[PDB]
Amino acid sequence: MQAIKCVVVGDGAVGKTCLLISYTTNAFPGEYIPTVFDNYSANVMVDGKPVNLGLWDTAGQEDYDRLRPLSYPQTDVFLICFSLVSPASFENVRAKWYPEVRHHCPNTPIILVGTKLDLRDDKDTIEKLKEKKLTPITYPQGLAMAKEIGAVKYLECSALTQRGLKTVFDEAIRAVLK
């Protein structure tokens, strides 16, 4: 047995809590309640080895900035989350999340996760952004950010559909091993 500490960071309402509930209990929560410092646990097999993956959910609100670095010590892998539909959450990776993670943990690996993949191709979501004069974050746009922040791997996933979600946590353990 080899326990791995994992901290999921990102902007408000990006889909961090949803991503963790959809992976652990295999069901989507739906109801939106802003989390403060929730914790989740799941035992997953990666490369024929038993891993007791420790999940740490953080608050996306700038009001809870003070308590956030308490989850950071002794962490094995980080997950910077941004919404693929919201370009403000993508810009917040460079301006808020990446320098905050490196300030407390400069030798801990980071993986850039593009939350809400199902809403990227949806007709109703694009119309809402077209009126606000905003364009959704494509794969080469998100990959360029992951290279800029020095992330080991870039993955896109959706909590509602479960597409790519199983790969996100699988590649997370792989980063710790090497």
């Binding site: 989390t35 410092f37 914790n39």
Partner: peptide, 8 residues
Amino acid sequence: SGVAGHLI
């Protein structure tokens, strides 16, 4: 807080 806190 929530289902599991773990903050010192």
